[PDB]
Design a binder for this molecule. Structure first.
Ligand code: BCL
Ligand code: BCL
Ligand SMILES: CC[C@H]1c2cc3[nH]c4c(c3C)C(=O)[C@H](C(=O)OC)c4c3nc(cc4[nH]c(cc(n2)[C@@H]1C)c(C(C)=O)c4C)[C@@H](C)[C@@H]3CCC(=O)OC/C=C(\C)CCC[C@H](C)CCC[C@H](C)CCCC(C)C
Ligand SMILES: CC[C@H]1c2cc3[nH]c4c(c3C)C(=O)[C@H](C(=O)OC)c4c3nc(cc4[nH]c(cc(n2)[C@@H]1C)c(C(C)=O)c4C)[C@@H](C)[C@@H]3CCC(=O)OC/C=C(\C)CCC[C@H](C)CCC[C@H](C)CCCC(C)C
Ligand SMILES: COC1=C(OC)C(=O)C(C/C=C(\C)CC/C=C(\C)CC/C=C(\C)CC/C=C(\C)CC/C=C(\C)CC/C=C(\C)CC/C=C(\C)CC/C=C(\C)CC/C=C(\C)CCC=C(C)C)=C(C)C1=O
Ligand SMILES: CCCCCCCCCCCCCCCC(=O)OC[C@H](CO[C@H]1O[C@H](CS(=O)(=O)O)[C@@H](O)[C@H](O)[C@H]1O)OC(=O)CCCCCCCCCCCCCCC
Ligand SMILES: COC(C)(C)CCC/C(C)=C/C=C/C(C)=C/C=C/C(C)=C/C=C/C=C(C)/C=C/C=C(\C)CC/C=C(\C)CCC=C(C)C
Ligand SMILES: COC(C)(C)CCC/C(C)=C/C=C/C(C)=C/C=C/C(C)=C/C=C/C=C(C)/C=C/C=C(\C)CC/C=C(\C)CCC=C(C)C
Ligand SMILES: COC(C)(C)CCC/C(C)=C/C=C/C(C)=C/C=C/C(C)=C/C=C/C=C(C)/C=C/C=C(\C)CC/C=C(\C)CCC=C(C)C
Ligand SMILES: COC(C)(C)CCC/C(C)=C/C=C/C(C)=C/C=C/C(C)=C/C=C/C=C(C)/C=C/C=C(\C)CC/C=C(\C)CCC=C(C)C
Ligand SMILES: COC(C)(C)CCC/C(C)=C/C=C/C(C)=C/C=C/C(C)=C/C=C/C=C(C)/C=C/C=C(\C)CC/C=C(\C)CCC=C(C)C
Ligand SMILES: COC(C)(C)CCC/C(C)=C/C=C/C(C)=C/C=C/C(C)=C/C=C\C=C(C)\C=C\C=C(/C)CC/C=C(\C)CCC=C(C)C
Ligand SMILES: [Fe+3]
Lengths: 55, 281, 49, 42, 307, 55, 55, 55, 43, 43, 43, 55, 55, 51, 42, 42, 37
C-alpha cells in the first residue's frame, strides 16, 4: 500500500495517463448512453413527463 | 527486327518441351512448343465463333452470341448448333489460356527472371474455369455457364445476380469489390508518383525515391516504398480475383436464397436480437 | 523442409477448427466459435519459434 | 526500472497522481449519492 | 522452393528518416512516428512524419465534422443504445432530402437537413484535400500528376453527389451516407435507368477497372520478377537503364509483340486508372438526363436484339 | 487574464489564425444551414409567406 | 485596429489572395445556387409569370 | 494538488491544448444535437409553438 | 521582424491597396443588396 | 524565450491586435443577435 | 525537465494561465447551466 | 508457495500488467453483461419494477 | 516420472506458461458456458425459481 | 522407435500430440453430449427430477 | 534470468503485486457479500 | 538443451510448477465437492 | 543425441503409459456407471 509508487518505475506516465484518460471517457460515455436508452432512467424523458412538456 | 539491346538475350534454351524444334522467333513473338499450341487453339476458337455467327444469322459483332447447352443437356454433349460449339470453344479457350501461361514460363526461363507473371496469370485462368467449368459442374449443367457474346454475357451476369436478389449483399463479393477499387486507387497513385519524380517542374532535376518517400509521408504519414508498392499491386489484384472466384463458387451451391437474408445472422444474435429500437427493432 | 512458420501456420489452422467447434457448441452459436477460434488461433500463429 | 525514473521521481509522481484520483473519486462519490437520492437503483 | 521476394527475409532498422526538405515549410512537419515491425515484412516499417499546414487542418477538421455528423445521426437512429448501434451499424442511413423539396435547402433536419450539412463538410474536406495534394507536390518540385489523377476521382464523386442532382433538379437523386443504403442506391439506380450494363460508358468504366487489375498484376509481377536485378529502383532504371529494364521489356515483347519502358509503363498505369472514373462520371451524367432506359437505347444502337 | 498573451509564445501565430478562421467558417455555415432547415426560421420561406410569393 | 496591416509580415500575399479569391467565388456561387433553388427568388422564373411568358 | 502543474513536464502543452480544444467542441456539439433531437428541449421548436410560427 | 520577409513599410503599402480593393468591392455589394431589397424584401 | 521564438514583447504586440479583432467581431455578432432577437425571439 | 523540457518555473506559470482559462470557461458554463435550469429544469 | 515470485524472472512485469489489465476488465464486462441479460438480475429493470417506474 | 523436469530443457518456460494460461481459461469458460446452457445447472435460473424472482 | 525424436524436433512433436489428443478427447465428449442416451447432465436431470 | 530481475528485485516486486491483489480481491468480496445480501444466487 | 537450463534450474522450476498444479487442482477438487454436495451430476 | 533420444523416449513412454492407465480406469468406471455393450 506504501510501495505502489514503484509502478511508475515500470510504466511511462505519458502512456498510462493517456490510456486511463481515454478509458475513463469511453466508459463514462458508455454508461450515460446506457442510461439515456433506459426509459426508467432517461432524465430528459423523465422531466418531460414531470413537467407535462409532452404536449 | 530487334530492339537495339535485344540481340545479347536471344540465346538457345529454356524451353520446357520440344528442345530446339520450336526454339525460334517470328518477328517479335517467341514461338516455342506452346506458341504453336496457343495459335492453334486461338485460331480454332476464333473461327468457330465466326461460324457460330453464320448459324446465328447475324454479322453485327455486338449481337454475335455463342450460348451453352440448355439445362436439359446436363453435363452431357449438346448438338453443335445448340450448345456444342460453345463446348468446343470453351476447350479452345482453356487450351489457349493454359498454353499462353506455359509459353510465358519458357520466356521467363530464357530471360532468367522470376515466374511471377505466369503465376499471376494463372489466377485469371482459375476465375475463368470457375465460371465455365467448376461451378457448372457443381451445379450439374453447362447452361449455368455464361455465353460468349459481348453484351449477352452481361445478361448472364444480370440474370445470375438477380436470382439471389441484390448481389451486392454477397459478403465475398463485397471483399472482392474492395480489392478491385483499392487496386485501381493504388495504380493511379503509383503511376502518378513515379511520373511526378521523373517529370518534375520545368528546369528542375529528376527527383529521387527519397522525394517519393517524402511526398507520401507528407501527404498521409506513411510510405510503403518502392518494393512494397509492387508487392501491394500484385497482391491486391490477385486477392480481388480470389475473392471473386470464392463469391461465385458458393453462390448456388451452398447459398440459395436472397443474399440480403444472410446478414440477419448478425441482427439475430441473441444478446441484442430483441432490444427495441434502431432499424431492426 | 517445413519451416517453423510453416509448421506454425499448419498447426494454427487446426486450433482454429478445434477451438471453433468447442465454443460454437459451448456458446450456442457458430459466431462464438469463429470469434474465439479466430483469436486463439491467430495468437498461436503469430508467435513462431 | 525501465522508465529510467529515479525512485525519488516515482514517489513525487505518485503523490500527484493519487491526489488527482482522490479528487476524481470524491466527485464520483457525491454524484452517485445525488443520483441515488434522486432515483435509487436498489 | 525458391525465394519469391513477396515478404522480406531480414529487416534492418537505421535511424529515423526525416525526408527531403526542398521548399517544404519544415515547421509544419511533425515528428517521426513509431516503427512497425509488422509493416516491415511487406513494405517500410517507419510511420510518419506527416505535414499539416493550412489545407491540412481545413481538410482534417471538415472531414472530422462530416464523419461526426453521420455518427451522431447513427447514434440517434440507434436511440442512443450502444447495443442497437452495433447491431444496426450497417443499416443506419443519413438519407438526402425527399423529392418534393427539390433543390431547396428548406428540408427539415430529420428529413434531409442533416444530409445537406454532412454533404457540405464532405465537399470542403475533399476539395481541400485536393489542393493539399497539389501543394505537397509543389513544395517538393514534383510534377502535379497525383493532383490531376485525384481530380478524375473527384469528377465521378461530384457527378454522383452534386452535378447530377442539380441537373435532375432534386437532392433526392444523391447518394445516402450508409453502408447498405449506398448499395441499395446503386442497385436502385440501375433499375430506374433500365439496366446500367447497357450504358456504354459503364461498359468502358468496367473495361478500365478490369484493365487496372490486369495492368497492376502484370506490372507488379514484372517488377518482382526482375527485382533480382534491382528493377524496383525504377527511377535509376529510367536514368540509367540496367539489365532489369531490358529483361522486362523483352519478356513482354516476346510474349505479346510490343512492350513499354520503365517511364512509359507508368503512363499506361495512370491513364488506365484515371479512365475508370472519367468515363464513369460521364456515364452517370448521361443517366436520366439524356437516357432514361439504357436497354432500349441499346436496342436502337445495335447492341441488343430488337423486340 | 493578463498573461493570456503568452499563448503566442507557445503557439505559432499562423497556425492559430488559420485554425480559428477555419473553425469560425464551418461553425457559421452550420448554424445558417440549421436555421434554413428549420421551418420557423428559414427567412426566405418566411418572407415568401408574408408577401404571398410561391413558397 | 490600426495595426490590422501587421498581418502581412505574418501571411504571404500570394497565399492570401488566392485563398480569398477561391473563397469569395464559392460563397457567391453558393448564394446564387441557394436563391435559384428557391421558387420565391428564382428571377428567371419570376419573370416568366410577371410577363406571362409561361405556357 | 499543488504539484498538478508538473503535468507540463510530462506532456507537450501544444499537443494537449490542440487535443483539448477538439474534445470540448465535439462534446458540446454532441450535447446540443442531443437536445435538438429531444422534442421537449428543442428550443427552435419550443419558440415556434410559443409564437405560432407554424400554421 | 517577421515570417514573410516583407518590410513594415511594404506591409503598409500593400494593406492600403488591399483595403481599397475591399471597400470598392463591398461598396458594390451594398448597392446590390439595397437594390434587391427595394425590388423584393427578404425580411 | 518561448517555443515560438517570439519575444515577450512580440507576444504582447500580436495579442493586442488579436483582441482588437476579437472584440470587433463579437461586437458585430452581438448586434446581429440583438437584431434577430428583436425580429424573431427564440426564447 | 521531466520529459518535455519545460522547467519548474516555466510549468508553474503556464499552469496558472491554463487554470485562469479553466475557471473563466467553467464560470460561464455555470451561468449557462443556471440560466437554462431557471428556464427549463431537467430534474 | 515460497518460490512463485520467480515468475517475475520469466515474464517482464510490463507485458504482464497490460495483459492482466485487459483480461480482468473484459472478464468483468462479460459478467455484468450476462447479468444485464438476466431478468432476475438486470438491476435497472428490477429497480423499475420495485419503484413502478415503467408505464 | 522423476525426469519430467526435463521438459523445461526442451520447451521454453515462457512459451509453455502462456500456452497453459490460455488453455486453462478456455477450458474453464467452456465448461461454465456449457453449464449455463443446461437448465439443469444454470445457477441463475435455478435461483430465479427458488426465490420467485420473475413472478 | 526412439529414432523419431532425432527425425523430428520434439518441440514440434509435442505441439502436435498435445493439441490433437485434446481435440480428439473434446470431440468425443461433445458428441456424447449430443446424444440422448449418454448426456450425463441431462440424464441426471431425470434421475433427480430437476427439470 | 530472462527479465534480468535480481532475486531481491523479484522478491520486492512480488510483495507489492501481492499487496495489490489482496486489496483488489478483498474489495471484490465486499461487493459479493453486499450483492448476496441483496439477492442470493445460491 | 534448447533452453540452456541447468539441471538445477529445470528441477527447481519444475518443483515450483508442480506446487502450482497441486494448489490449483486441490482448490478445483474442493470446488467440485462444494457443488457435488449441492447437486450431484450422476 | 542418440543417447538423449534413448532418455527422452523412456520418459515419454513412461508418461504415455501413465496416461493410458487412467483411461483404462475411466472406461471401466463408465462401463460400471452405465454399460455400453
Ligand atoms: C458420460 C461421459 C463421462 C466421462 C467419460 C470419460 C471417459 C470414458 C474418459 C474421460 C476422460 C477424461 N475426461 Mg470425461 N467424462 C465425463 C465428464 C467430464 C467432464 C465434465 C465437465 O463433466 C470433464 C472436465 C471431463 C474431463 C476428462 C479428462 C480428465 C480426461 C481427458 C483428458 C485428455 O484427454 O486431455 C488431453 C490429453 C492430452 C495428452 C493433452 C494434454 C494437454 C495439452 C498438452 C495442452 C497444454 C497443457 C499445458 C501447456 C501444460 C503442459 C505440461 C508440460 C509437461 C509442462 N470429463 C462424463 C461423466 N471421460 C478420458 C481419460 O481418462 O483420459 C485419460 C477417458 O478415457
Ligand atoms: C445493380 C448494380 C448495377 C451497377 C450500378 C452502378 C452505378 C450506379 C455506378 C456504377 C459504377 C461503377 N461500376 Mg457498375 N453496376 C452493376 C455492375 C457492375 C459490375 C459487374 C461485374 O456486374 C462491375 C465490375 C461494375 C463496375 C463499376 C465500376 C467500373 C464503376 C465505379 C468506378 C469506381 O472507381 O468507383 C469507385 C470510386 C468512386 C466512387 C470515387 C470516390 C472518390 C471520392 C473523392 C473519395 C472520397 C473519400 C471519402 C472522403 C472518405 C475518406 C476516408 C479516408 C480514410 C480519409 N459494375 C450493375 C449493373 N455501377 C459507377 C460508374 O461510374 O458508373 C458509370 C456508378 O456510379
Ligand atoms: C488475375 C488478375 C488480373 C489478370 C492478370 C493477368 N492477365 C494476363 C496476365 C496477367 C498477370 C498475363 O500475363 C496475360 C498477358 O499476356 O497479358 C498481356 C494476361 C492476359 N489477360 C487478358 C485479358 C483479360 N484479363 C482480365 C482480367 C485479369 N487479368 C485479372 C483481373 C480480363 C477481364 C474480363 O477481367 C480480360 C479480358 C489477355 C490480354 C491476356 C491473355 C491472352 C491470351 O490468353 O492469349 C492467348 C489467347 C488468345 C490470343 C485468344 C483466345 C481466343 C479464344 C480461343 C476464343 C475466344 C473465347 C472467349 C471465351 C470468348 C469470350 C467473349 C467475351 C465477350 C465474353
Ligand atoms: C482515379 C480513380 C481512383 C482514385 C484515385 C485517387 N484517389 C485519391 C488519390 C487518387 C489519385 C489521391 O491523391 C488521394 C489520396 O490522398 O490518396 C492517398 C485520394 C483519396 N482517395 C480516397 C478514397 C477513395 N478512393 C476511391 C476510389 C478511387 N480513387 C478510384 C479507384 C474510393 C472508392 C469507394 O472506390 C475511396 C473511398 C482517400 C483515401 C483519398 C482522399 C482523402 C480525402 O479527401 O479525405 C477527406 C477526409 C479527411 C481528410 C479526414 C476524414 C476524417 C478522419 C477520421 C480524420 C480525423 C482527424 C481529427 C483531427 C481527429 C480528432 C479526434 C478527436 C476526438 C480527438
Ligand atoms: C516495368 O515495365 C514493364 C514493361 O516493359 C519494360 C512492359 O512492357 C509491360 C507490359 C505492359 C504494357 C506494354 C502496357 C499495355 C498492355 C496492357 C494494358 C495489357 C493488355 C495487353 C493486350 C490487350 C495485348 C495482348 C496481346 C495478345 C493476346 C497477343 C496477340 C498476338 C497473337 C494472337 C499472336 C501471338 C503469337 C504466337 C503465340 C506465336 C506465333 C507463331 C507460331 C505459332 C509459329 C507458327 C508460325 C511460323 C512458324 C512462321 C510464320 C507464319 C505466320 C506468321 C502465319 C502462319 C502461321 C500458322 C501457324 C499457320 C509491363 C507490365 C512492365 O511491367
Ligand atoms: C484406361 C482408362 C480407363 C477409363 C475408364 C472410363 C472412365 C470414365 C469416367 C470418367 C470419370 C470422371 C468424369 C467426370 C465426373 C463424372 O462422373 O461426370 C459425369 C457427368 C455426367 O453427369 C450426369 O449426371 C449428373 C449426376 S451424377 O453425377 O450422376 O449424380 C448430372 O448432374 C448431369 O446433368 C448429367 O449429365 O459429366 C460430366 O461431369 C462432364 C465431363 C465433361 C468433360 C469434357 C468437358 C467438355 C465441355 C466444356 C468444358 C471444357 C473444359 C476444358 C478443360 C480442359
Ligand atoms: C458500462 O458498464 C457496465 C454497465 C457494463 C458495468 C461494468 C463496467 C466496468 C467493468 C467498469 C470498470 C471500471 C473501472 C475499472 C474503473 C477504473 C478507474 C480508474 C483506474 C480511474 C483512475 C483515475 C485517475 C485519475 C483521475 C488521476 C489523475 C491524476 C492527476 C490529475 C495527476 C497526474 C500526475 C502528475 C501530473 C504528475 C506530476 C509529477 C511529476 C514528477 C512530473
Ligand atoms: C449543433 O450545435 C450548434 C451549432 C447548434 C451549437 C454549437 C455551439 C458551439 C460548440 C459553439 C462554439 C463557439 C466558439 C468556441 C466560438 C469562439 C469564437 C471566437 C474565439 C472568435 C474569435 C474571432 C476573431 C476574429 C473573427 C478576428 C480576429 C482578427 C484579427 C486577429 C486581426 C487580423 C485580421 C485581419 C486584418 C483580417 C484580414 C482579412 C481576412 C479576409 C482574413
Ligand atoms: C449528453 O451527455 C452525453 C450522453 C453525451 C454524456 C456525456 C458525459 C461525459 C462523459 C462528459 C464528459 C466531460 C468531460 C470529461 C469534460 C472535461 C472538460 C475539461 C477537461 C475542460 C477543461 C477546460 C480548460 C480550459 C478552457 C482551459 C483554457 C486555458 C487557456 C485559455 C490558457 C492556456 C494556457 C496558456 C496560453 C499558457 C500561457 C503561459 C505560458 C508560460 C506559455
Ligand atoms: C458466467 O461465468 C463465467 C463465464 C463468467 C465464468 C468465468 C470463469 C473464469 C475462467 C474465471 C477466471 C478468473 C480468473 C482467472 C481471475 C484471476 C484474477 C487475478 C489473478 C487477479 C489479480 C489482480 C491483481 C492486482 C489487482 C494487483 C495489483 C498490483 C498493484 C496495485 C501493485 C503494482 C506495483 C508494483 C508491483 C510495484 C513495482 C515494483 C518494483 C520493484 C518496480
Ligand atoms: C464436456 O465438457 C468438456 C468438453 C470440457 C469435457 C472435458 C474435455 C477435456 C478433454 C478436458 C481436458 C482437460 C485437461 C487436459 C486439463 C489439464 C489441466 C492442467 C494441465 C492443469 C495444470 C495446472 C498448472 C498450474 C496452475 C501451474 C502453475 C504454476 C505456477 C504458479 C508456478 C510456475 C513456475 C515458476 C514461476 C518458477 C520459475 C522458475 C525459475 C527458475 C525462474
Ligand atoms: C463511435 O461513434 C462516433 C459518433 C464517435 C463515430 C461514428 C462514426 C460512424 C459510424 C460513421 C459512419 C459513416 C458512414 C457509414 C459513411 C458512409 C459513406 C458513404 C458510403 C458514402 C457514399 C457516397 C457519397 C457521395 C457520393 C457523396 C458526395 C457528396 C458530394 C459531391 C458533396 C456535394 C455537396 C452538397 C450536396 C452540399 C451543398 C451545400 C451547400 C451549403 C452549398
Ligand atoms: Fe513501378
Amino acid at each position: 500500500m506504501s510501495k505502489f509508487y514503484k509502478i511508475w518505475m515500470i510504466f511511462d506516465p505519458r502512456r498510462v495517463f493517456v490510456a486511463q484518460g481515454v478509458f475513463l471517457f469511453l466508459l463514462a460515455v458508455m454508461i450515460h448512453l446506457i442510461l439515456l436508452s433506459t426509459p426508467s432512467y432517461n432524465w430528459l424523458e423523465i422531466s418531460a413527463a414531470k413537467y407535462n412538456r409532452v404536449a | 527486327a530487334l530492339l537495339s539491346f535485344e540481340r545479347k538475350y536471344r540465346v538457345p534454351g529454356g524451353t520446357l518441351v520440344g528442345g530446339n524444334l520450336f526454339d525460334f522467333w517470328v518477328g517479335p513473338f517467341y514461338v516455342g512448343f506452346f506458341g504453336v499450341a496457343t495459335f492453334f487453339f486461338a485460331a480454332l476458337g476464333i473461327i468457330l465463333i465466326a461460324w457460330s455467327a453464320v448459324l446465328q444469322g447475324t454479322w453485327n459483332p455486338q449481337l454475335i452470341s455463342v450460348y451453352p447447352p440448355a439445362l436439359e443437356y446436363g453435363l452431357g454433349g449438346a448438338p453443335l448448333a445448340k450448345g456444342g460449339l460453345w463446348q468446343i470453344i470453351t476447350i479452345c479457350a482453356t487450351g489457349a489460356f493454359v498454353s499462353w501461361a506455359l509459353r510465358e514460363v519458357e520466356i521467363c526461363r530464357k530471360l532468367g527472371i522470376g515466374y511471377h507473371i505466369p503465376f499471376a496469370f494463372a489466377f485469371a485462368i482459375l476465375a475463368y474455369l470457375t465460371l465455365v467449368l467448376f461451378r457448372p459442374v457443381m451445379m450439374g449443367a453447362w447452361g449455368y455457364a455464361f455465353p460468349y457474346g459481348i453484351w449477352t454475357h452481361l445478361d448472364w451476369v444480370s440474370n445470375t445476380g438477380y436470382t439471389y436478389g441484390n448481389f451486392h449483399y454477397n459478403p465475398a463479393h463485397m471483399i472482392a469489390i474492395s480489392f478491385f477499387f483499392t487496386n485501381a486507387l493504388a495504380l493511379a497513385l503509383h503511376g502518378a508518383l513515379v511520373l511526378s519524380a521523373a517529370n518534375p517542374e520545368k528546369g528542375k532535376e529528376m527527383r529521387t525515391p527519397d522525394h517519393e518517400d517524402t511526398f507520401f509521408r507528407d501527404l498521409v504519414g506513411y510510405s510503403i516504398g518502392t518494393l512494397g508498392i509492387h508487392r501491394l499491386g500484385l497482391l491486391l489484384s490477385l486477392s480481388a480475383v480470389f475473392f471473386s472466384a470464392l463469391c461465385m463458387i458458393i453462390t448456388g451451391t451452398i447459398w440459395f436464397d436472397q443474399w440480403v437474408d444472410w446478414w440477419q445472422w448478425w441482427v439475430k444474435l441473441p444478446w441484442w436480437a430483441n432490444i427495441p429500437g434502431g432499424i431492426n427493432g | 523442409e517445413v519451416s517453423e512458420f510453416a509448421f506454425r501456420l499448419m498447426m494454427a489452422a487446426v486450433i482454429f477448427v478445434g477451438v471453433g467447434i468447442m465454443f460454437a457448441f459451448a456458446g450456442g452459436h457458430w459466431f462464438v466459435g469463429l470469434v474465439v477460434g479466430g483469436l486463439v488461433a491467430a495468437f498461436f500463429a503469430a508467435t513462431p519459434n | 526500472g525501465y522508465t529510467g525514473l529515479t525512485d525519488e521521481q516515482a514517489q513525487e509522481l505518485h503523490s500527484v497522481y493519487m491526489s488527482g484520483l482522490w479528487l476524481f473519486s470524491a466527485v464520483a462519490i457525491v454524484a452517485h449519492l445525488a443520483v441515488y437520492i434522486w432515483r435509487p437503483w436498489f | 522452393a525458391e525465394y519469391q521476394n513477396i515478404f522480406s527475409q531480414v529487416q534492418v532498422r537505421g535511424p529515423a528518416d526525416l525526408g527531403m526538405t526542398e521548399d517544404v515549410n519544415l515547421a509544419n512537419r511533425s515528428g517521426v512516428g513509431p516503427f512497425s515491425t509488422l509493416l516491415g515484412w511487406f513494405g517500410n516499417a517507419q510511420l510518419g512524419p506527416i505535414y499539416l499546414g493550412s489545407l491540412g487542418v481545413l481538410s482534417l477538421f471538415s472531414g472530422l465534422m462530416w464523419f461526426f455528423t453521420i455518427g451522431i445521426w447513427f447514434w440517434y437512429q440507434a436511440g442512443w443504445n450502444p447495443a442497437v448501434f452495433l447491431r444496426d451499424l450497417f443499416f443506419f442511413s443519413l438519407e438526402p432530402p425527399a423529392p418534393e423539396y427539390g433543390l431547396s435547402f428548406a428540408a427539415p433536419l430529420k428529413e434531409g437537413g442533416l444530409w445537406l450539412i454532412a454533404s457540405f463538410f464532405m465537399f470542403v474536406a475533399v476539395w481541400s484535400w485536393w489542393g493539399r495534394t497539389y501543394l505537397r507536390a509543389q513544395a517538393l518540385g514534383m510534377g502535379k500528376h497525383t493532383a490531376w489523377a485525384f481530380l478524375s476521382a473527384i469528377w465521378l464523386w461530384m457527378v454522383l453527389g452534386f452535378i447530377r442532382p442539380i441537373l435532375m433538379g432534386s437532392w433526392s437523386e444523391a447518394v445516402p451516407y450508409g453502408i447498405f443504403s449506398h448499395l441499395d442506391w446503386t442497385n436502385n439506380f440501375s433499375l430506374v435507368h433500365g439496366n446500367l450494363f447497357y450504358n456504354p460508358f459503364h461498359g468502358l468504366s468496367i473495361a478500365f477497372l478490369y484493365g487496372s487489375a490486369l495492368l497492376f498484376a502484370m506490372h507488379g509481377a514484372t517488377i518482382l520478377a526482375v527485382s533480382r536485378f534491382g528493377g524496383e529502383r525504377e527511377l535509376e532504371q529510367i536514368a540509367d537503364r540496367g539489365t532489369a529494364a531490358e529483361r522486362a521489356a523483352l519478356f513482354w515483347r516476346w510474349t505479346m509483340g510490343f512492350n513499354a519502358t520503365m517511364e512509359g509503363i507508368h503512363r499506361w498505369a495512370i491513364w488506365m486508372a484515371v479512365l475508370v472514373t472519367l468515363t464513369g462520371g460521364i456515364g452517370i451524367l448521361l443517366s436520366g438526363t439524356v437516357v432514361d432506359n439504357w436497354y432500349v437505347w441499346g436496342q436502337n444502337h445495335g447492341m441488343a436484339p430488337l423486340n
